[PDB]
Each structure stands twice: as structure tokens, then as C-alpha cells.
Design a protein around this ligand. Structure first.
Ligand SMILES: CC(=O)N[C@H]1[C@H](OC[C@H]2O[C@@H](O[C@H]3[C@H](O)[C@@H](O)[C@H](O)O[C@@H]3CO)[C@H](O)[C@@H](O)[C@H]2O)O[C@H](CO)[C@@H](O)[C@@H]1O
Ligand SMILES: CC(=O)N[C@H]1[C@H](OC[C@H]2O[C@@H](O[C@H]3[C@H](O)[C@@H](O)[C@H](O)O[C@@H]3CO)[C@H](O)[C@@H](O)[C@H]2O)O[C@H](CO)[C@@H](O)[C@@H]1O
Lengths: 171, 171
């Protein structure tokens, strides 16, 4: 239920602002001073102008490095988030990965749903579930995901714990 | 640190899958059966198809009522979320309010950032706190937000509890 640092990076539903103390709400108490994520009155920096950091809550990063929605943020110059432009990736783009765990279609563009994560998916939250490791001819996961003992890619102690074949192993 | 139901409608950062058990991670144990939000393998339903339902994590609802990202989703047809087309609202669109607490600009389009939430903001998460209640001519807030004791609009205990002048007051 807590959010921000007090909630492990958690986000509030419906763009609700996460107060500096880690609770979800709307109003100055949450959206004002110390706002962690959500519709912060005080807009979060991103991309080029902010060390490459991405926007939380899947907001778009304007050409100016500010987080939000609308033509201004998602239109021309958008550096991140659901940009109105099509985001290239995969072999077709220097082997690039999609941002914020987006899947890369076989056609070389970023997205989510069966058309992007389905078959041909190059990276991101692909739902194909290709095996990795000892039995996959030594295959390693994409996105530094952890290859578990059963030889599946994922993130969470069950994938990254002891017996973590490769990737972001805790162990 | 719980997501979905077990964490009060809370969502994971970076489109991480909220498991049936309320924990964030990626993989089948998270993104497969039971997934409550995030980049679930079997995409969430929305729109007119699912009773008017919005998409979690600010995903787009395609014309067919499935949640995701990419041309197919946010492109033509888009029913909700950060569509490619501009979302009209306010007095221009029949006093229509923006979805997901988005701000309705002075011009009749939804968004987040100083441009939609500042001067002229019509509904949604405006950063401007127009006073409500007794000391405001008995003005009421937009979106059924709670007019608080001290005379401010917001959501959360402080605003909707004891001294809630109007709105989504509980007590
Ligand atoms: C979309 C976006 O990221 N807006 C930022 C804003 O952008 C910084 C640049 O602003 C340009 O001027 C904007 C101005 O801010 C708007 O109010 C106006 O309506 O449109 C013009 C378009 O150019 C300047 O040209 C440029 O020098 C930058 O300053 O910055 C503010 C904070 O400064 C931010 O809150 C907002 O999200
Ligand atoms: C954008 C969207 O909502 N996609 C839905 C899809 O929507 C109905 C249409 O499905 C098309 O089929 C998909 C196919 O399932 C994808 O895997 C493939 O890569 O692309 C096509 C085109 O989007 C039909 O061709 C079209 O006529 C519509 O009926 O429905 C599917 C379930 O059928 C859903 O999984 C997908 O997320």
C-alpha cells in the first residue's frame, strides 16, 4: 500500500500522487512538496536533461526533459513513454532494447500486447517464454533478466535466487 | 510493497507484472495467469468491451478493448489512455472530464504538466488549488474530489475524513 521509497517504487492507480511520506492521494498534501510519482504538481525531469532517467507511471518525457501527457509531452521531441512516434528497436536499430520493459516486435518497434510481445519479440516483456541456460545451448535472457533453475527468464527472488543460471542473479 | 488487490490497486514500476499474489516481478509466475496489472501476457480488457474499464499503468485501450502500447493500441481507434489523438474535454466537449485524473486544459484537451494543470485547468489534477466550501462561496471540486475542512480539494484521509464539506466524503 505505501508508494515511492516507502513502497518499493510502487505507483498509485489513476496517476494518483505519491506523497513524500509514501501514501497515495490527490491534493496539495500528496501532489505538492515531495511528490514521488503520479500527477505531481511539481513535474519530474527525465531523459537527456536528467541523466537518462525515465518518467514514472508511463508518462512521456518531453523534448525539454519534463514528464507528462498531451501534445506537448508525447508529441514532437518526446524522449520516452507512449510517444506518438514509433520507437525503433532490435537488430533493425543497432540491437536496441525497448524502454521500461517494452517488447520489441519482429518488425523493430516498441509496444505491448500480442503484436509486440508475441512471436518474433526481440526483447522486453515477451510472452513467448523461450528457455535459457544449461539446456538452451547456453542461451542467456534479454534485458539482463534472470535465467532461473528451471531455465526461464524473469525478475523476482524465484528467478534471481540460488540456482540463477545467468542475468541479474541475486545469487 | 504489495500490488494489485493485495496492495490496494497499487501498480509496479517499469511495467512489472503484478502477480495473483500481489507481488511485482517479470516472468510467467508474474505475467501469466492471475496477473492483475503491468505487462501481463494476456492483455487486460477495457473500454466499451469491458463495461467502460480503463487500463492500468496508463496503457492504451485499442479500438477492440485490449490494453497495450504501440500503433495498434494508441493509434487509430484508441478508446483510452495516452492515445495518439488529442482527447477533448471541458466546456468545449460538454463539460466532459478527463480520464485517469488527467488535467483538462484551458483549450479542451487532456494532459499532465504545467500546460494542462496550470492556469485555466478545468478538471482533473490541476496544480492550482481553487478554494472550495464556505470560504469560497460554497464552491464544489471537480471529479467528485473531497472538499476538505480547511477548504481544499484532494483525495485521501485528510481530505475526505472529518470536516469534509462535499465531494467523495466518507466521514
Ligand atoms: C512540454 C514541457 O516540457 N514543458 C515544460 C517547460 O518547457 C521548458 C522550455 O519551455 C519553452 O517554452 C514553453 C513554455 O514553457 C510553455 O509554457 C509555452 O506554452 O510553450 C513554450 C514552448 O517553447 C522554452 O522555449 C524553453 O526555453 C524551455 O524553458 O518548462 C517548464 C519549467 O521551466 C516545465 O514545467 C514544463 O513541463
Ligand atoms: C490492438 C488489439 O486490441 N489487438 C487485439 C486483437 O484485436 C482484434 C483484432 O485482432 C487482429 O489480430 C491480431 C493478432 O491477434 C495479433 O497477434 C497480430 O500480431 O496482429 C493482429 C492485428 O492486430 C485481427 O486481425 C483483427 O481483425 C481484429 O479482430 O485481438 C486479439 C485477439 O484476437 C488480441 O489478443 C489483441 O491484443
Amino acid at each position: 500500500q505505501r508508494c515511492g521509497e516507502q513502497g518499493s517504487g510502487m505507483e498509485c492507480p489513476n496517476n494518483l500522487c505519491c506523497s513524500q511520506y509514501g501514501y497515495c492521494g490527490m491534493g496539495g498534501d500528496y501532489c505538492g512538496k515531495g511528490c514521488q510519482n503520479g500527477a505531481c504538481w511539481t513535474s519530474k525531469r527525465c531523459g537527456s536533461q536528467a541523466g537518462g532517467k525515465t518518467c514514472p507511471n508511463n508518462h512521456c518525457c518531453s523534448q525539454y526533459g519534463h514528464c507528462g501527457f498531451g501534445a506537448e509531452y508525447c508529441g514532437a521531441g518526446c524522449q520516452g513513454g507512449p510517444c506518438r512516434a514509433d520507437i525503433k528497436c532490435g537488430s533493425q536499430a543497432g540491437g536496441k532494447l525497448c524502454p521500461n520493459n517494452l517488447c520489441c516486435s519482429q518488425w523493430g518497434y516498441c509496444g505491448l500486447g500480442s503484436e509486440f510481445c508475441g512471436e518474433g519479440c526481440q526483447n522486453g516483456a515477451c510472452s513467448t517464454d523461450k528457455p535459457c541456460g544449461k539446456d538452451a545451448g547456453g542461451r542467456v535472457c534479454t534485458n539482463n533478466y534472470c535465467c532461473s533453475k528451471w531455465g526461464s527468464c524473469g525478475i523476482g527472488p524465484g528467478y534471481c535466487g540460488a540456482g540463477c543460471q545467468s542475468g541479474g542473479c541475486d545469487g
